[PDB]
Design an enzyme around this catalytic site. Structure first.
Site, PDB file in Angstrom:
ATOM      1  N   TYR A 131      -0.051  -2.282   9.334  1.00  0.00           N
ATOM      2  CA  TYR A 131       0.995  -1.153   9.469  1.00  0.00           C
ATOM      3  C   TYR A 131       0.475  -0.079  10.559  1.00  0.00           C
ATOM      4  O   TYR A 131      -0.348  -0.393  11.214  1.00  0.00           O
ATOM      5  CB  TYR A 131       0.904  -0.489   8.157  1.00  0.00           C
ATOM      6  CG  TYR A 131      -0.687   0.193   7.702  1.00  0.00           C
ATOM      7  CD1 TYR A 131      -0.951   1.441   8.386  1.00  0.00           C
ATOM      8  CD2 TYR A 131      -1.462  -0.799   7.035  1.00  0.00           C
ATOM      9  CE1 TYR A 131      -2.239   1.785   8.127  1.00  0.00           C
ATOM     10  CE2 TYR A 131      -2.741  -0.040   6.899  1.00  0.00           C
ATOM     11  CZ  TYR A 131      -3.157   0.920   7.226  1.00  0.00           C
ATOM     12  OH  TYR A 131      -4.370   1.368   7.011  1.00  0.00           O
ATOM     13  N   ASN A 152     -12.453  -3.428   9.275  1.00  0.00           N
ATOM     14  CA  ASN A 152     -13.215  -2.470  10.225  1.00  0.00           C
ATOM     15  C   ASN A 152     -14.608  -2.442  10.707  1.00  0.00           C
ATOM     16  O   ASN A 152     -15.489  -2.797   9.781  1.00  0.00           O
ATOM     17  CB  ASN A 152     -13.003  -1.033   9.272  1.00  0.00           C
ATOM     18  CG  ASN A 152     -11.688  -0.619   8.835  1.00  0.00           C
ATOM     19  OD1 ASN A 152     -10.636  -1.010   9.374  1.00  0.00           O
ATOM     20  ND2 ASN A 152     -11.484  -0.053   7.800  1.00  0.00           N
ATOM     21  N   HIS A 197     -10.767  10.373   0.633  1.00  0.00           N
ATOM     22  CA  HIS A 197     -12.074   9.945   1.142  1.00  0.00           C
ATOM     23  C   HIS A 197     -12.400   9.603   2.464  1.00  0.00           C
ATOM     24  O   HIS A 197     -11.315   9.572   3.252  1.00  0.00           O
ATOM     25  CB  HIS A 197     -12.458   8.369   0.255  1.00  0.00           C
ATOM     26  CG  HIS A 197     -11.635   7.240   0.757  1.00  0.00           C
ATOM     27  ND1 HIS A 197     -10.349   6.913  -0.046  1.00  0.00           N
ATOM     28  CD2 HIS A 197     -11.624   6.574   1.784  1.00  0.00           C
ATOM     29  CE1 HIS A 197      -9.684   5.997   0.781  1.00  0.00           C
ATOM     30  NE2 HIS A 197     -10.413   5.750   1.677  1.00  0.00           N
TER      31      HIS A 197
END
Length: 211
Positions: free
Chosen positions: A67, A112, A185
């Site tokens: 995305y 990540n 978060h």
């Protein structure tokens, strides 16, 4: 009292968090070597344009689905690289075997890779893109994930998050309900002292808006 409010919020966040130590040190070592392979392949220019996202603090690798504010959009089918076989065999399989998620659920794997002092700014997992639960697996070192991140913007009014969750190497975090939908978060720079990577396993929604 403000103390009671923080305690009820933290209880609600907790009800949306499940966590287990699922990967041994050797299993982590094998996955970390594979993560190093992805980083190397990206540097070789072997991935699609939208598979790799480079930023000062962190690199993002999108597999299966990807995305581009609540205005995230899924890239058209086949735009990002497919989920690598080792993610199925070494990560997803272990999760399926331990009944964390059903087979066929995951169509999205994001890696990540964080530098020391890396961080995530306050955010919510985009509800219009991804179903719940959201599954993440931590790899190179231990860190913490914070919930309720007003402190990142108003540090005089509030110095701490509502909750800080230890995220140790080889642990699996499962987010649902309140913890995934009702609270932000983040990760604090002081909580990433050395290299840390995380694999995020998600299912996209059918009607997730596409470009």
């Amino acid at each position: 009292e403000q103390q009671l409010q923080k305690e009820e919020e933290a209880r609600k966040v907790k009800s949306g968090i499940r966590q287990m130590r699922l990967f041994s040190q050797d299993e982590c070592a094998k996955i970390e070597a594979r993560i190093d392979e992805v980083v190397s392949r990206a540097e070789k220019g072997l991935y699609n344009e939208h598979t790799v996202d480079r930023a000062p603090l962190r690199n993002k690798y999108f597999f299966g689905e990807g995305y581009t504010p609540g205005q995230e959009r899924l890239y058209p089918p086949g735009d990002v690289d497919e989920i690598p076989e080792w993610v199925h065999q070494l990560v997803i399989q272990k999760l399926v075997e331990h009944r964390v998620i059903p087979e066929g659920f995951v169509n999205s794997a994001v890696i990540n890779d964080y530098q020391p002092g890396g961080c995530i700014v306050s955010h919510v997992d985009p509800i219009h893109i991804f179903e719940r639960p959201i599954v993440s697996v931590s790899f190179f070192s231990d860190s913490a994930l914070c919930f309720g991140c007003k402190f990142q913007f108003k540090p005089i009014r509030v110095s701490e998050p509502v909750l800080s969750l230890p995220v140790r190497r080889g642990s699996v975090t499962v987010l649902s309900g309140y913890a995934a939908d009702e609270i932000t978060h983040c990760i604090r720079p002081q909580d990433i002292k050395e290299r840390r990577a995380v694999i995020i396993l998600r299912k996209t929604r059918l009607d997730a808006p596409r470009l």
